Amino acid sequence: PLTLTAATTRAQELRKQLNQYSHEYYVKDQPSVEDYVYDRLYKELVDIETEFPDLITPDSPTQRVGGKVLSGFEKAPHDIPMYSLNDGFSKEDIFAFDERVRKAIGKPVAYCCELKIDGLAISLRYENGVFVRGATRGDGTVGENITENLRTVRSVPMRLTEPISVEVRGECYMPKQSFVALNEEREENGQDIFANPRNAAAGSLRQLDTKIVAKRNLNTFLYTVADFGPMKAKTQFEALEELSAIGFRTNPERQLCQSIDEVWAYIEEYHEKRSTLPYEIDGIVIKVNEFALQDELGFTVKAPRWAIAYKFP
Numbered sequence: 001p002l003t004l005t006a007a008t009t010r011a012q013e014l015r016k017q018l019n020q021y022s023h024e025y026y027v028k029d030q031p032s033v034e035d036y037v038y039d040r041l042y043k044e045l046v047d048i049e050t051e052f053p054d055l056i057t058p059d060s061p062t063q064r065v066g067g068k069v070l071s072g073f074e075k076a077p078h079d080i081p082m083y084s085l086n087d088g089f090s091k092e093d094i095f096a097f098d099e100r101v102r103k104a105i106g107k108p109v110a111y112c113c114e115l116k117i118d119g120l121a122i123s124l125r126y127e128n129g130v131f132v133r134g135a136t137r138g139d140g141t142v143g144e145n146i147t148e149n150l151r152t153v154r155s156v157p158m159r160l161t162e163p164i165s166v167e168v169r170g171e172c173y174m175p176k177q178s179f180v181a182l183n184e185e186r187e188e189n190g191q192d193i194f195a196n197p198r199n200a201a202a203g204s205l206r207q208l209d210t211k212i213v214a215k216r217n218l219n220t221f222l223y224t225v226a227d228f229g230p231m232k233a234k235t236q237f238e239a240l241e242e243l244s245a246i247g248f249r250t251n252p253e254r255q256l257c258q259s260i261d262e263v264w265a266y267i268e269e270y271h272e273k274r275s276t277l278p279y280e281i282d283g284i285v286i287k288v289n290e291f292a293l294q295d296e297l298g299f300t301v302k303a304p305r306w307a308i309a310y311k312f313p
Ligand SMILES: CC(C)(CNC(=O)c1ccc(Oc2ccccc2)cc1)c1ccc2c(N)nc(N)nc2n1
Pocket: 080, 081, 082, 083, 084, 085, 114, 115, 116, 117, 223, 224, 285, 287, 303, 304, 307
């Protein structure tokens, strides 16, 4: 019953179908099929892999549960630095930022506005569509290679929609509910609770046992293209849409603003919706939308001159 030949073909069918369902469930936050449909196919795949372990692949959904236990993390260089952001705290700071931008560019400019997610910055590298390296930001030029841990974060694709080679960046965070649940479990086990979601996500990704990480319910929001590869985006808003197109999870609250006044309205809007979000945010990030204009503004030693983070008090 069921030969290696038949199982080999069936395994790929299952991985493709299950991965599509996972993409819808974890990346789109909108499943198409009921859980039992996914569970049935998943069990079939588990049976095939148990019978023929050689059919297990890096992109099989069964690998999300982890298993490897590292002795420590290897250094993860960032040839393209992961910059920090300059901060603003008042309406004055924001309009001041706009003034400097207009002074340098010589004309009004559009701004892509995004929410600043309270989590840990991460870099994801793909070669021919295959996930090959996951890394923390560290000090900006050198972080930690946490590839194995990130393989367990359900929203991180193991194989992209297109076999392209790129490096993208974003935030890995822990949703409020999972943060609450985790602290309750720690209280039950006599452990020190995490002070906030940020520390919980950072501590989770520092865990050497991938099995533990797999149960931490971490999620992601990607917003930066570091190595474009064949990507076509020419603006940040376009980049966000393209990141979504190739398979990554992006934050849906993004908005392209045609004026600094629209920018401030965005800030006021989400400062109010803040408590309603399933994840914590420490602010709003405002970026000159056009890459050509970002290039003109350049970077300071620490951050780009074309973006600013409005921090909530
Ligand atoms: C804007 C940027 C600083 C990312 N960008 C970069 O790090 C970056 C780095 C080299 C770049 O270009 C170079 C490429 C090669 C060599 C030198 C520069 C361009 C952007 C940033 C930082 C933190 C963010 C955050 N917490 N939330 C959101 N929503 N957005 C954020 N955006």
